[PDB]
């Protein structure tokens, strides 16, 4: 027999506290004996959990949140935000024929030395009492919406560290800004960010992690 | 008058060495004996002294270039990638 389960310790998962309860679940790895101990091996791990698990309500069923573990405080794993991305069926549900799709990306820097790329997907909307049945744009409104989005998505960042970027990401306050600024150009129905991906992580800043782990 | 139809400068070679070799030599010897624009003084006065040595007959400026051209394509690419690395480190 070999049964490498017996040499495992069953650590725990803790989210950042910029959210609701952080009892995500149980990590299962190994015993941290000599010969390439597990104290350092678990440093480079990313976990995938839905946002509605970390917020309770069922309105956030999409936009699953990735958390990157940072330290092991004995029996634990302390995680920071790693990325946000929608679930697959949510893109499929919002993508429909007879509507323009507008997408925009900027690689933007926060107040911290954070380098991370943000997207934004927009779907043109049929207005009420309309008899036209495709609601396409004019291919300059697409560049007008994209230019407005790129200005909005650059002004919300370059303050807004990831400690407070997640506090604007959850309440859809970016979507409010896009609709209140683009609605003069074209009616829109599904405004979303749909993707947060982290590119370059700076120096660790152990103090900044502790703020989100009460 | 047009003295030769296609051999050009390679008419010095007569009929020997093969048409393809003379033609390959023609492309590189036209570059080798051309006159290039001086990036410094702006004049078209750069002529090869030796392979890799390009000298302006005014302003007395010598640049190290290719064997038969002032600048080779792989080296402009090298110069473009060196500078792109430089601003991002300097950023």
């Amino acid at each position: 027999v070999v049964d490498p389960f017996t040499r495992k310790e069953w650590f725990d998962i803790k989210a950042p506290s910029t959210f609701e309860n952080r009892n995500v679940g149980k990590t299962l790895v190994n015993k941290s004996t000599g010969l390439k101990s597990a104290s350092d091996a678990l440093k480079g791990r990313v976990v995938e959990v839905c946002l509605a698990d970390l917020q309770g309500s069922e309105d956030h069923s999409f936009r699953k949140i990735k958390l990157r573990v940072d330290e092991v405080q004995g029996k634990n794993l302390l995680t920071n935000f790693h990325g946000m991305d929608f679930t697959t069926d949510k893109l499929r549900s919002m993508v429909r024929k007879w509507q323009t799709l507008i997408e925009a990306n900027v690689t933007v820097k926060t107040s911290d030395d954070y380098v991370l790329r943000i997207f934004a997907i927009a779907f043109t909307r049929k207005q009420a009492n309309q008899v036209k049945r495709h609601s396409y744009a004019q291919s300059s409104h697409i560049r007008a919406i994209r230019k407005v989005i790129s200005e909005i998505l650059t002004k919300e960042v370059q303050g807004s560290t990831l400690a407070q970027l997640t506090s604007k990401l959850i309440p859809e306050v970016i979507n409010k800004e896009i609709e209140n600024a683009t609605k003069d150009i074209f009616p829109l129905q599904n405004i979303h960010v749909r993707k947060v991906k982290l590119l370059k992580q700076p120096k660790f800043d152990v103090g900044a992690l502790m703020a989100l782990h009460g | 008058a047009k003295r030769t139809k296609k051999v050009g400068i390679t008419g010095k070679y007569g009929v020997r060495y093969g048409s393809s070799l003379r033609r390959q030599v023609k492309k590189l010897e036209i570059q080798q004996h051309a006159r290039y624009d001086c990036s410094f003084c702006g004049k078209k006065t750069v002529k090869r002294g030796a392979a890799g040595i390009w000298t302006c007959s005014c302003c007395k400026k010598t640049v190290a270039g290719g064997a038969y051209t002032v600048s080779t394509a792989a080296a402009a690419t090298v110069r473009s990638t060196i500078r792109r690395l430089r601003e991002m480190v300097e950023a």
């Binding site: - | 990036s39 410094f40 003084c41 702006g42 004049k43």
Partner: protein
């Protein structure tokens, strides 16, 4: 739009071309503006900057060699530095751009 401003000076204002006449115009204080080509040698570029610092004359840096400067003037010869002796109908002096 800067070639357009420089071209209008040629047909309406007063100018001098080259270096021996630009320095001599800086020397006697009859230069409003001098434009230096991009590939002008730095030793000549720094002496023009010093001469225009003493005479209190603005300096524009053309984004082009002596070939393009002479074309922007409307000539068919390389121009290293052009000294605007008097503006024409253009706004080249008012807008340093």
């Amino acid at each position: 739009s800067i070639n357009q401003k420089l071209a209008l000076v040629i047909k309406s204002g007063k100018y001098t071309l080259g270096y021996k006449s630009t320095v001599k115009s800086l020397r006697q204080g009859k230069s409003k503006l001098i434009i230096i080509a991009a590939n002008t040698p730095v030793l000549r570029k720094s002496e023009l900057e010093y001469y225009a610092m003493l005479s209190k004359t603005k300096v524009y840096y053309f984004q082009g060699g002596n070939n393009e400067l002479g074309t922007a003037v409307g000539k068919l010869f390389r121009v290293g530095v052009v000294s605007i002796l008097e503006a024409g109908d253009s706004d080249i002096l008012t807008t340093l751009a």
